[PDB]
Design an enzyme around this catalytic site. Structure first.
Site, short mmCIF file in Angstrom:
data_model
loop_
_atom_site.label_atom_id
_atom_site.label_comp_id
_atom_site.label_asym_id
_atom_site.label_seq_id
_atom_site.Cartn_x
_atom_site.Cartn_y
_atom_site.Cartn_z
NE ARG A 86 -3.95 1.50 1.49
CZ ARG A 86 -4.64 2.31 2.39
NH1 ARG A 86 -4.00 3.62 2.40
NH2 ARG A 86 -5.48 1.69 2.75
NE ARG A 96 -6.13 2.69 -0.22
CZ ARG A 96 -7.24 3.42 0.41
NH1 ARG A 96 -7.96 4.36 -0.43
NH2 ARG A 96 -7.49 3.06 1.69
CG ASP A 99 -9.17 0.46 2.61
OD1 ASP A 99 -8.49 0.83 3.63
OD2 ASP A 99 -10.29 0.86 2.21
CG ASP A 101 -11.27 0.82 6.30
OD1 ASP A 101 -10.25 0.84 5.97
OD2 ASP A 101 -11.96 1.56 5.32
#
Ligand code: APC
Ligand code: PH2
Ligand code: PH2
Ligand code: MG
Ligand code: MG
Length: 397
Positions: A86, A96, A99, A101
């Protein structure tokens, strides 16, 4: 201990591999345990915007257990995002690699500058809300205890749930470019294009493209190169139109075809499926350079072990090599079959099985028709799936 739902997204490179390596990274932690992985979802990239940034996302979410503090967990995830590849906080939401989260921590409410939980966008994104509800069907957002999130998910509108999965066994959809699959009409060679579409909707994680015919009783280098290359270019023209970008396997027996196709398309290629031994030394050299998976076919134990030695002797990682019993290449099948699990251990390589429409491996008479071949492939594909064969190579899913 606290249960977390971690959202995972990616829209660049080998998408499903990027998700697998993230999951695998979290499980590797001794203070984290994976409880459940959700399904795979596909969605238009949500931008906020150069045209080139709209390439479909792959999203899921995993429910973990951990005694990590929320701020500690974020540090780990940022670390995991970097190992995978990343970038240096690149522009506002461009392609990306991964990712990760924090979507939810059961009923936690954490409102700070570094971290806010639930994720502030959770209830405005179906690609986040849908995988979460899948894992936690009774979950309510702690600041909207009233809101029925199932209805909320409806206001967010269609999101495509893929039949591709995060299983251990992955399907290799066969894409044949030879005469055998020729049907083309006056103004359309769409045959191969619709075949890919259907492999994709039906759930294939990998596609295997071969230009040379299957039937025992050639074609030239530029010829075989021209077929693979035109399709690979077509594939690139669609990258952004695929609901799912599959991993691609180049199935060729010619060093010069590998060389040519990899010089041009190495960026979209995952694996090389070489049916013959040929120039193994030179082949290992090329695949070492391009860091691709490679597959060793018995065209058993010692024969494969021999080949494995050369490869390692030429600079590729054991983890990048699968062996294949080589069904259909010379009863005797069903016993190697019944013992693939044993073979895999001795060898120390992941296994690739291509039982599709080979009446012996299946145990039907040579006479069998197409539907009879298919149903038997399919039912045996389930046996291997529960036996965790790593790749199964099939005509239909
Ligand atoms: N639930 C959560 N999960 C991950 N990061 C969060 C977060 N809540 C707040 N943040 C913060 O936002 C930061 C930036 O992370 P990025 O991944 O670069 C933004 P993004 O994920 O692309 O946007 P998005 O969160 O709207 O999806 C983190 O460094 C982090 O401190
Ligand atoms: N479809 C989709 N769109 C997004 C996603 C995502 O995961 N899926 N993540 C974003 C920023 O993190 C921005 N936009
Ligand atoms: N790895 C592997 N590759 C193949 C196989 C096979 O059985 N295994 N069969 C083919 C045509 O029958 C073509 N390619
Ligand atoms: Mg995000
Ligand atoms: Mg983020």
């Amino acid at each position: 201990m606290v249960q977390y739902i971690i959202g995972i997204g990616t829209n660049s490179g080998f998408t499903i591999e990027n998700i697998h390596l993230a999951i695998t990274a979290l499980e590797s932690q001794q203070n984290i345990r994976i409880i459940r992985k959700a399904s795979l979802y596909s969605s238009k990239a949500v931008l906020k915007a150069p045209k080139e940034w709209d390439i479909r996302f792959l999203n899921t979410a995993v429910k973990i257990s951990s005694s990590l503090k929320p701020d500690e967990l974020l540090v780990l995830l940022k670390d995991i995002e970097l190992k995978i590849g990343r970038d240096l906080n690149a522009p506002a939401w461009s392609p990306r690699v991964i990712d990760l989260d924090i979507l939810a921590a059961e009923d936690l409410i954490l409102e700070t500058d570094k971290l806010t939980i639930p994720h502030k966008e959770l209830i405005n994104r179906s690609f986040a809300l849908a995988p979460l509800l899948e894992l936690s069907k009774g979950w309510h957002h702690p600041k909207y205890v009233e809101w029925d999130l199932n209805i909320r998910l409806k206001e967010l509108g269609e999101i495509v749930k893929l039949k591709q999965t995060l299983a251990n066994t992955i399907r290799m959809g066969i894409v044949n470019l030879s005469n055998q699959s020729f049907s083309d009409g006056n103004f359309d060679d769409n045959q191969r294009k619709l075949n890919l579409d259907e492999l994709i909707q039906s759930g294939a994680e990998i596609i295997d493209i071969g230009a040379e015919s299957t039937k025992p009783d050639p074609i030239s280098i530029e010829e075989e190169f021209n077929k693979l290359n035109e399709f690979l270019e077509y594939f690139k023209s669609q990258l952004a139109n695929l609901i799912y970008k599959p991993l691609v396997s180049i199935d060729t027996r010619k060093l010069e075809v590998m060389q040519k196709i990899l010089a041009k398309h190495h960026d979209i290629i995952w694996m090389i499926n070489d049916v013959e031994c040929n120039n193994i030394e030179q082949k290992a050299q090329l695949i070492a350079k391009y860091n691709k998976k490679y597959v060793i076919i018995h065209n058993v134990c010692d024969y494969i072990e021999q080949k494995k030695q050369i490869l390692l002797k030429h600079g590729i990682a054991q983890q990048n090599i699968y062996f294949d019993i080589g069904f259909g290449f010379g009863d005797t099948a069903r016993y190697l079959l019944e013992n693939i699990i044993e073979i895999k251990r001795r060898l120390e390589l992941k296994a690739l099985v291509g039982h599709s429409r080979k009446p012996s491996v299946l145990g039907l008479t040579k006479d069998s028709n197409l539907a009879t071949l298919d149903r038997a492939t399919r039912e045996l594909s389930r046996k291997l799936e529960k036996l965790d064969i790593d790749i199964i190579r099939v005509h239909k899913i």
